[PDB]
Design a protein around this ligand. Structure first.
Ligand code: CUZ
Ligand code: CUA
Ligand code: CUA
Ligand SMILES: [Ca+2]
Ligand SMILES: [Ca+2]
Ligand SMILES: [Cl-]
Ligand SMILES: [Cl-]
Ligand SMILES: [K+]
Ligand SMILES: [K+]
Ligand code: NA
Ligand code: NA
Ligand SMILES: [Zn+2]
Ligand SMILES: [Zn+2]
Lengths: 586, 576
């Protein structure tokens, strides 16, 4: 298995890394582990203008007021349990958002603030028959309504909710109230069942209380029952949201139609579907085990053919101190991170199941040391029924002495491990910034990217619509439109000349600059910067971009093209002239 | 005979040999790489807003940025490291902001931006370089674009006698302006000699069959400043000297050396003999003899062209030059898409008419190189081991990732007689230029000092409230202001709940009293756009308004402990 990608060689896999609390998505080549691209999502990106431009702020909605995000879990849309390469979804824990990235243009094209919740943490996609739903955990219990009259998490109206988002429209589909709280989640290989771990079955707010119970649980959702209740109109709404809300709590011991609670020790964390579709595997964290939920026993559990919810557990292997996450090679082994022991442990799921039935046997195959304190791990295609068992990335939280010193803040250490053989082999230490939690890999042929924009692309269609009201054809017009104290500049661009090289406004005017890059070549991107106005954006081939700012300073102000595009790059410039307020009315 | 055969694989457990400091380009940060692995070890926020650490959101960072904290963007190109006696001393890194006309200082012991200045009365700081000898007293900075003076909207004509740009000197230690020099034309790039007397800059817009490199007599400038012979502009107290030619007469502070053609790069050879100006539109470099500049300013030379001692023909589109310390220069050919290696002394002899070939090798790069940088090339210790060429079009060299492409930063072994390309490093947002330093030239703190200037103003606020940041967990109420102070020790915030009134302006100050390297904590307030880092022994603070009634969770964002998920707290906001 080639480990090094020489000059002129291409990587075999795409890797999509979460940005952690830096808020972006990063695109890596695997196995070289080099960063090919950054995709801004919840961060403000100076280079492309994401969070400054009118297109990006329209996608972010009211949340464009936040300059931060915290993402953990990137996942790729699937058709029949295999990646189809259309979309990447990722969570925002800091401002309770889910974002969709369009993998053909590698940009965030949709974003939603999940109503009536705080902190979207766990996120995963339906696998079968395709990704109809994005499943998203809200982590923290809050009052409903949260109007400041009740603060107690033990009140009957204090709770958190499981969230399903329509992948294609990126509108809420439903929400399910649960007991306890929600950590990570996964889905089965039929479309019926999803599952989430809970660590706060105590509904406490202090550390001691959140650890009291010997077992919390994984809550299992019967999505068919949920949809059936929705189509039946048997749901409520909260506040101003029209999202159907269903009640998944126990009510005096009796289970909801929508949920079952499997007792699992202890403050469990990871929740991973095996690539063969047999198991939900929950990482015990404070318990030195994983718990294996048999998905094929779930219909019986929901029909009361089982006497005890624990009867869906068919294994609970002892793996080591602080199991956090599990991934799969597709050969019948699971790999689990041990945060405290700082290892990855390879174990055989079928043997662990036999040992739970008393058949004494050694299901642990190998323990590999990692550096240090691993969180997530990801084996190539592990989330599909094409799990290929080639590469394994383990994302550790303390790199200590593994890289040159760079001050008090250290990088993370994302370590690439060869699992194609019987023995795991550590091959590469990859330092990353801001704590990626999780990543996801796709084969090179599973991702198809556009090199030039289509002119009808929904990303800037609202801008095309604005132009039409001014009688503007964006493909050819270089025009300055005036409307009271607003000025709308429309221009084409072809290196090294802006189509409007100068224009004049009154001090205080609100200026929108719309630029259409009418180039038809690849890698031919232009920029636009207005000096000393905090204005910056990218316009790639056939794209239209626009940015709005206030001409608050009298005098002559230069604008320039930022993206090196030509041998005459530092000469693709223009001038905005701002007439002083004292020479105009008022 | 000596071969180029350095090892590029830094396996697990092994450490890189050099630090690389990459500019962030249009993204606005600075990036720290290990060389030769070319892996990114750290990002240093400067002009960007960084969700992870809170740079741009915290009180400490917005204090450093001053009024310019209102800008969420930057555009940097030129990172440089402070020198003592012509050698890197590891103290500071400086970098430019072309978009909002700033210079930033980074302290290399903490790897944080600690000072920032908006340069007055100019637009767009582009070229930037450091005084070398006797140390980096001055940061030299080019303002690129010509503007009216004053720029109040009465005059827009760029040919007006009061429309010009200026060369800028910033005091490196105080990060206050030292002086500005009005010049003719446009400034592009700049460098300094190895004595402290001279600096030089290419000018592309003298408007021209020839533009020039302008040469500054920094001693003469300092003399005038100390005798009070200067004017000031607008409301800036900065001494301003007039370096323009007047009726064909020369300023005391400047000489204009004719050089073709829209010259771009301006690079000082490591032996200190030459300012080398890359020809861009002319397929040449021009070599100015620094030891002839005293005679130039003394009026002992018949013609400003007399200080030119070499003009080698290299290829199409020379943009920049670097040095191996063995007597070779390395120049990027932007059109030919090559690095050309050439011998500077053979170039000088050729210029006299000897038939001697000074070109040693041309290496193909991919594609369209701009800047290049050999290790320690800006110092008299240039070691001739590694070369990075930063190329603007990666085309097919990496997997496709949509309409936007990465820059291709190519690592080249120059240790032997033949350059060898050994690695392609894709980078985001056109870093443009970089600088390398030996591992042993950089010394960083592992934990913060409690007296650090970075958060000294926050320590002062706490002093006014009577707070001992090392021990106290308290909530001060002051009208509609709320100042929460707390220690933190994973897995617990030192204040786990507090209550305020809707609309209160809340300041949260957190001190990480851990003593263990790498145990960094975070603080995020859910749905309030609040996020910051607190590393060991650091104090950080952030102000926001509690505009939403009800219970609002905060949590630690830096995975710090087995019980990370449970290190949380509650803000309770009583309705108005
Ligand atoms: Cu948010 S948690 Cu184990 Cu995913 Cu990092
Ligand atoms: Cu247009 Cu560079
Ligand atoms: Cu504090 Cu994780
Ligand atoms: Ca618990
Ligand atoms: Ca010119
Ligand atoms: Cl998980
Ligand atoms: Cl230069
Ligand atoms: K870390
Ligand atoms: K580029
Ligand atoms: Na939306
Ligand atoms: Na300052
Ligand atoms: Zn440059
Ligand atoms: Zn350049």
């Amino acid at each position: 298995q080639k480990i090094h990608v020489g000059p002129g060689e291409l990587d075999d896999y795409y890797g999509f890394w979460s940005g952690g609390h830096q808020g972006e998505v990063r695109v890596l080549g695997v196995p070289s582990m080099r960063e090919l691209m950054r995709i801004p999502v919840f961060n403000v990106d100076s280079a492309t203008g994401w969070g400054l431009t009118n297109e990006s702020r329209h996608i972010m909605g009211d949340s464009a007021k936040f300059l931060n995000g915290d993402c953990h879990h990137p996942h790729i849309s699937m058709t029949d349990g295999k990646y189809d390469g259309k979309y990447l979804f990722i969570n925002d824990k800091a401002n309770s958002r889910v974002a969709r990235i369009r993998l053909d243009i590698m940009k965030c094209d949709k974003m939603i603030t999940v109503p009536n919740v705080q902190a979207i943490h766990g996120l995963r996609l339906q696998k079968v028959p395709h990704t109809k739903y994005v499943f998203a955990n809200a982590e923290f219990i809050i009052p409903h309504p949260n109007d400041g009259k009740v603060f107690d998490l033990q009140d009957e109206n204090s709770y958190t909710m499981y969230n399903a988002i329509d992948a294609e429209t990126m509108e809420m589909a439903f929400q399910v109230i649960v007991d306890g709280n929600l950590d990570n989640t996964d889905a089965d290989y039929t479309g019926r069942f999803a599952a989430a771990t809970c660590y706060n079955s105590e509904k406490a707010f202090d550390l001691g209380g959140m650890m009291r119970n010997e077992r919390d649980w994984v809550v299992v959702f019967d999505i068919h029952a949920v949809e059936a209740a929705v189509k039946a109109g048997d749901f409520i709404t909260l506040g101003d949201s029209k999202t159907p809300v269903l009640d998944g709590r126990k009510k005096d011991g009796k289970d909801s139609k929508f949920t079952r609670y499997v007792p699992v020790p202890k403050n469990p964390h990871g929740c991973n579907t095996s690539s063969d579709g047999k198991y939900f595997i929950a990482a015990g964290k404070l318990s030195p085990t994983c718990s294996m939920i048999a998905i094929d026993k779930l219909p019986d559990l929901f029909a009361g053919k089982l006497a005890d919810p624990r009867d869906v557990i068919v294994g609970e292997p002892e793996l080591g101190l602080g199991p956090l996450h599990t991934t799969f090679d597709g050969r019948g082994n699971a790999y689990t991170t041990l945060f405290i022991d700082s290892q990855v442990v390879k174990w055989n799921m079928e043997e662990a199941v036999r040992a739970y039935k008393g058949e004494k046997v050694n299901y642990i195959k190998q323990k590999l040391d990692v550096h240090y304190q691993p969180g997530h791990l990801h084996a190539s295609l592990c989330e599909t029924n094409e799990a290929d068992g080639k590469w394994l990335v383990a994302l550790s939280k303390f790199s200590k002495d593994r890289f040159l010193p760079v001050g008090p803040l250290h990088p993370e250490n994302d370590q690439l491990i060869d699992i194609s053989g019987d023995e795991m082999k550590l091959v590469h230490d990859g330092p990353t910034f801001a704590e990626p939690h999780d990543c996801i890999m796709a084969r090179r042929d599973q991702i198809k990217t556009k090199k030039i924009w289509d002119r009808n692309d929904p990303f800037f269609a609202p801008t095309v619509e604005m132009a039409k009201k001014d009688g503007i054809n964006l493909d050819t017009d270089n025009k300055v439109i005036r409307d009271g104290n607003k000025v709308r500049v429309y221009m084409t661009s072809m290196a090294p000349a802006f189509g409007v090289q100068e224009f004049t406004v009154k001090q205080g005017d609100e200026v929108t600059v719309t630029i259409t890059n009418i180039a038809q070549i690849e890698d031919v991107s232009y920029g636009f910067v207005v000096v000393n106005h905090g204005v910056s954006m990218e316009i790639s081939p056939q794209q239209t971009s626009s940015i709005t700012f206030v001409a608050d300073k009298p005098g002559l102000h230069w604008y320039y093209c930022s993206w090196f595009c030509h041998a005459l790059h530092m000469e693709m410039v223009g001038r905005m002239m701002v007439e002083p307020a004292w020479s105009h009315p008022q």
